[PDB]
Every structure is written in structure tokens, then in C-alpha cells.
Amino acid sequence: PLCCTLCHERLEDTHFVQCPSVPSHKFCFPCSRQSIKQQGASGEVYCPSGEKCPLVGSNVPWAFMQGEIATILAGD
Amino acid sequence: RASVIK
Ligand SMILES: [Zn+2]
Ligand SMILES: [Zn+2]
Ligand SMILES: [Zn+2]
């Protein structure tokens, strides 16, 4: 089933974050909000799995764009 | 890249 990697909640009928390089890394907005809060205290916000997963095609961790952060932190 | 938000 399509479920959040961190809290295991089913993702149907909700928005979620999809890691570009690891299809199974999917995160609900509540978990993504917590990850942004925790990570952004110290810099860029990488994959909420903690694994610093790369961009597809480049050897560098992907990170949330400012617009993605703003979308997620606005609330439901 | 495309947005990560689905
Ligand atoms: Zn979750
Ligand atoms: Zn990932
Ligand atoms: Zn990126």
C-alpha cells in the first residue's frame, strides 16, 4: 500500500512528498512539516528519510525548494 | 527537476 515512510499512514486522498531517487521514500505533509522544522534549524532540508538521497542524474543530495517548503508549511 | 509534491 502507498504509505508514508515515517509514520506509515496511507497516502490516498492526501498530498505527499516523493523522493526523486528512491520511489519508496514518500512522506505525508505532517511528517514533512516536522522534518522541515528539524532540518531547517541547521541548513538545507534533505530527504525526510535522513538518507540524503541524490538528485536523479547528479551526485548531490536533493533538497526542498523554497516554494515546496512554503506549500507544505502553509497548512491544509 | 520536477516538484516533489504529489
Ligand atoms: Zn507521515
Ligand atoms: Zn529519499
Ligand atoms: Zn534539489
Interval between CA A74 and ligand 2 midpoint (Å): 23
Q: How far apart are CA A21 and CA A42, in angstroms?
A: 23
The method recorded for this entry reads: X-ray
Q: Does residue A21 sit within a domain?
A: yes
Q: Does residue A68 sit within a domain?
A: yes
A43 is in which domain, residue-wise?
A: 16-73
Q: Can you give the resolution of this entry in Å?
A: 1.5
Count other Cβ atoms within 10 Å, centred on residue A18: 16
Q: Does residue A7 sit within a domain?
A: no
Interval between CA A76 and ligand 2 midpoint (Å): 23
**Secondary structure letter of residue A6 according to DSSP:** T
Q: How far apart are CA A58 and CA A45, in angstroms?
A: 17
Q: Are A75 and A42 in contact (CB under 8 A)?
A: no
Chain B interface, best mutation among A4, A5, A12, A17, by max B CB count within 10 A: A17
Q: What is the CATH number of the domain that holds A39?
A: 1.10.10.1580
Q: Does residue A25 sit within a domain?
A: yes
Q: How many domains does chain A have?
A: 1
